[PDB]
RNA sequence: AGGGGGAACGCGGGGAAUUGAAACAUCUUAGUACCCGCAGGAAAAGAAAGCAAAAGCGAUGCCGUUAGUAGGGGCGACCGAA
RNA sequence: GAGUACCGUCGGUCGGAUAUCCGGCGGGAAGCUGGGAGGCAUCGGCUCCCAACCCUAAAUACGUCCCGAGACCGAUAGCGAA
RNA sequence: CUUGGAUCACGGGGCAGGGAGUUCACCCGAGCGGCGAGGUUAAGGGGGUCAACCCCGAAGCCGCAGGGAAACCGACAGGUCCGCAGCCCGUAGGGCGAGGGACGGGGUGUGAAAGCGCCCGGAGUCGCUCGGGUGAGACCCGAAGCCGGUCGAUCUAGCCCGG
RNA sequence: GGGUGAAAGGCCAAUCGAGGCCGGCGAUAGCUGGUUCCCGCCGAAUUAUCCCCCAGGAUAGCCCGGCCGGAGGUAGGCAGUGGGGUAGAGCACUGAUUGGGGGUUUAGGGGGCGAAAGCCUCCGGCUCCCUGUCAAACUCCGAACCCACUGCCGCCGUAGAUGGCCGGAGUAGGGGGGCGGUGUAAGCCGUCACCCGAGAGGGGAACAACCCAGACCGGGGUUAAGGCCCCAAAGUGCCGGCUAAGU
RNA sequence: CCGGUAUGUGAAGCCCGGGUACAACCGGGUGAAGCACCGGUAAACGGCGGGGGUAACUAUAACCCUCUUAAGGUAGCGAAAUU
RNA sequence: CCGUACGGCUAACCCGCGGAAGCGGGGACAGCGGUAGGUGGGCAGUUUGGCUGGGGCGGCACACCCUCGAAAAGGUAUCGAGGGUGCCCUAAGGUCGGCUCAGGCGGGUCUCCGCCGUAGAGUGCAAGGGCAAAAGCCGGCCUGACUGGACCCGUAACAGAGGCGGGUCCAGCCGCGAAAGCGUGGCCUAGCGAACCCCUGUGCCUCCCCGGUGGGGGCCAGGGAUGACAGAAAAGCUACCCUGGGGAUAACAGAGUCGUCUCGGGCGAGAGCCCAUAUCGACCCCGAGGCUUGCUACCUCGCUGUCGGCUCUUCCCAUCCUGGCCCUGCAGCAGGGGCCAAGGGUGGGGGUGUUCACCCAUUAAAGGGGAACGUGAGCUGGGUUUAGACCGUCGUGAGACAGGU
């Protein structure tokens, strides 16, 4: 027999991959060997639209 | 159909007519230390299909009668002709 | 120091199907075609924890026979040593 | 000369059949008053040999080549190519 | 090809050249030839005027004893008859009569045994050629397809990047 | 056996219900096609049993070549010893089949005098006598013809019989004509062994199997089937009778 | 398909007994998953009936008697691209 | 002493963060290796019979017995006619003795005596055959329904044979009977089956130098089955379909035949006010043609495969009108029925792919057939038989429909 879309997605072709080069970076917090108790302070400077997040991001 | 329990017949060891009890033969199953069964076991092993035929559900409506006749003076058994098919069979006096 | 090259011959691994059995599945085709690796002018083996049978031989390797035999096998078609 | 001889089990392979060889898994020795083989396993007797480390010529196979030959072809033949 | 071809059945424009029962291994038989209760050498060795020629080499295979699953046991170099050819007596016929046919006796297996089966009264082996069977591409041509390893998205399908 | 598919099995370099290229590969086939000089001697079969057998094979029958052995054999007929159940015929068994008569009354449904299932019958039945019809699965009878054996005729045979051994095949779609079963018939299935197949020549206008007749080569003559007005070789032939419709 | 598993069966291994001067071998016990069992699920696959009788002339049956299913085709549309 | 179910820990192992070093979380689970059972068209390899007046659905003529067919020896086929077996029986089997059946008549009432009775009954089960001091019924005793072995007939003629079946015997041990004699299942003809493998019985031979034990192999006999019965272990679609071939085999036109079909005839029942024949002509009997349809399977499987329509030419007569005549239940006008006659004519439209059939309005009348169902190297292209898709039914499904679009 022939294949399914289910089954062709699992190989990783341009017909199925994510175009992540189009997105803004990943969103993580901070590594906590740095945040022992120091309670960093920061300032927001921009709010932006990400095509891979279904949510705005902030710099 | 009715057969007696004891019958007076020729015993080829005593070489004369003695009295004989009538026994049916009870069927036992195959042994594992036999050569055919050994062959079968080693041909079933590994990656194969099935190497022999497998007829499932093959029988006659009526089967013949194995019958052994055992003397009383010596206690040795023997066969008495060929077999004959009947559906019912019961031993009596 | 290695690396790449070399018809056929060589050592080591992986491994089909057509076909035959007047179908076919165990078998056969066949450890074949083909694939991967490693060497040479030859390679590989080689000096008994062996063969044998009341007698004895004395490392390996090649030819001729043993022999279509012992023996394997839907005990079928067929395969097959020392 | 130890995960070795050996024992069970699985897969492959062999003529190797309850008696071939290779590998995986689980167990596993004695060690010179010692140990192995003798076609199912075990007991006894007798016969033969000392594994788990290494090297080794000669007789052999081939012919991308050479010499030399031929009840071979003779330009639609003979190698695909005189 | 067909029961059946002038056929409204197939092949058939003309000429020249090419073009289809081969080779091996085993088995059954024959037409000749050699030795003969024995026949025959293979690999190989030696010699030579060196791929021709000559001598050695019987390992092995067949045969001389068969029966039986096996253990095991282990036979008639002629006792009788009928009789073809040919020979002898003859005048039509009669006698001996190889080879041929039929009895009798024996070995063994099976069976208490008798009887039954195979076997026994000396001919095989070694070659050349031919016919055939079986297997190998196996008289010549013809498949659709099955398996293995490499090549391709300048066509066309889809996606990304930059226009 | 993978890709891509707004899904049509659509596209993947004029190739897609699984690409192209070399290899296994001179794959296999019981199916179609082909198979190269001359003369001479002999000369078939398409049918019984078995096969997932029915377009194919094996065992036998039917042809050929060699040899052994050694004296009978029988494709025809005459007489005899035996067997048989067909055609035809008939009703003696099985079973069917018209009607009229007697005799007895009933297995049973119609009624009346049924004073009450009877002494009386019904219309049926049962036994006989006449009358009229039948049989692939009937026979008290019964041919022609067929088979086996024995003896004689006749043929073959010592220039080698019946018979036996060894080897090489081909044949497993048959058809005309006569007989039988089935079928509205055409045809289907068998049987017989004369012909075509595998058979020239002479005639039927021509015709595979209907008649004559079986064929080395050169020549001569008489016949067969059938024909004799012209085509066309040979009679406008002879006697008796019929047809008027080109029958 | 899901869930539950008290109970039955259910392979290898392990344990007991017999046998084997050892093994093969025989018997029993333990015994998962699955099956069997009990339940939920139809915008899950699919399925959704017959024979009779009856009203003031005739017709028709609003009605009743029965045989019967897991349940007996609802609203609508209907000789239909389905007759 | 051996396992377990559960709770807990961190030090193996997995996760993350991080040059690293370590820190955090989980944790002896998981993952990894080896083994055992299940589920499993997700992927593969294959099978899915044959005969068959084409094939398929149906049946079994696919193993056996009897009668006919069947042609007076033997043999002889068809999807030929008519029926049966795939068992039962310790007696329904062996023998010995005694006795006779069904049906009816005549007595007696609702099994009793006598008689006639060739079998008109019965036989374990079909048909045929056999059988009367019996081969039937009534009884008494037994188990030859045994062992070891030879030869011959059939299946299967003539003429090949594996397995099965029957028959004539030798020897042994036995039964019945006074004896002779009979008895190797059922009066004869049906009731069943290879190789390999396994089970049972019996008593002997053998396992790699020798000898023991356990276990294995062999000879002989009996049994477990292949019904497609001289023996594979086994379901379907193709309209996307491919190859090799077939007129050995259908649909299509031809040939053959003519039951059916169209067109007719003989006879005279009866009907027609009465009157057999103006007209009609039953029931029964005899035919032509080849324009319907079937049956068969002789030609053609790549010649062409087709229906209707348009265009164009020609023929038959069994005559619709047009010409000429005869009978009438023919007053005239007309009608009905028949003879000669084929020179000419026989048209236009509505729905339907239609042919035919139906309808309208006119007309002298608006006939029926053949020519490869005339005519696609002449056109068209509506229907029908490809590949796309929809509905209804059938099917678990792939899918099908001589059902529609
Ligand atoms: Zn005894």
UniProtKB/Swiss-Prot annotation, chain A:
It comes from the Archaea. Coiled coil: none annotated. Disulfide bonds: none annotated. Belongs to the universal ribosomal protein uL2 family. Part of the 50S ribosomal subunit. Forms a bridge to the 30S subunit in the 70S ribosome. One of the primary rRNA binding proteins. Required for association of the 30S and 50S subunits to form the 70S ribosome, for tRNA binding and peptide bond formation. It has been suggested to have peptidyltransferase activity; this is somewhat controversial. Makes several contacts with the 16S rRNA in the 70S ribosome. This is Large ribosomal subunit protein uL2. It comes from Thermococcus kodakarensis (strain ATCC BAA-918 / JCM 12380 / KOD1).
UniProtKB/Swiss-Prot annotation, chain B:
GO terms for molecular function: large ribosomal subunit rRNA binding; structural constituent of ribosome; zinc ion binding. The keyword GTP-binding does not apply. A zinc finger (C4-type) spans 11-74. GO terms for cellular component: cytosolic large ribosomal subunit. Transmembrane segments: none annotated. Keywords: Metal-binding, Ribonucleoprotein, Ribosomal protein, RNA-binding, rRNA-binding, Zinc, Zinc-finger. GO terms for biological process: translation. Its cofactor is Zn(2+). InterPro entries: Ribosomal_eL44 (IPR000552), Ribosomal_LSU_eL42 (IPR053708), Ribosomal_zn-bd (IPR011332). Part of the 50S ribosomal subunit. Belongs to the eukaryotic ribosomal protein eL42 family. PANTHER family: 60S RIBOSOMAL PROTEIN L36A/L44. Binds to the 23S rRNA. This is Large ribosomal subunit protein eL42. The lineage of its organism: Archaea, Methanobacteriati, Methanobacteriota, Thermococci, Thermococcales.
């Amino acid at each position: 027999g022939k294949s399914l879309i289910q089954q062709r997605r699992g190989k990783g072709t341009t017909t199925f991959r994510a175009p992540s080069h189009r997105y803004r970076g990943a969103v993580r917090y901070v590594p906590l060997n740095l945040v022992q108790e120091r309670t960093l302070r920061g300032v927001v400077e921009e709010i932006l639209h990400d095509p891979g997040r279904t949510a705005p991001v902030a710099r | 159909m009715k057969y007696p329990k004891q019958i007076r017949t020729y015993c080829p060891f005593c070489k004369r007519h003695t009295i004989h009890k009538v026994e049916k033969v009870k069927k036992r199953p195959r042994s594992e230390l036999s050569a055919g069964q050994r062959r079968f076991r080693r041909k079933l092993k590994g990656y194969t299909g099935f190497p022999r035929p497998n007829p499932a559900g093959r029988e006659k409506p009526v089967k013949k009668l194995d019958l052994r006749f055992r003397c009383t003076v010596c206690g040795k058994a023997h066969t008495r002709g060929q077999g004959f098919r009947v559906k019912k069979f019961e031993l009596v006096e």
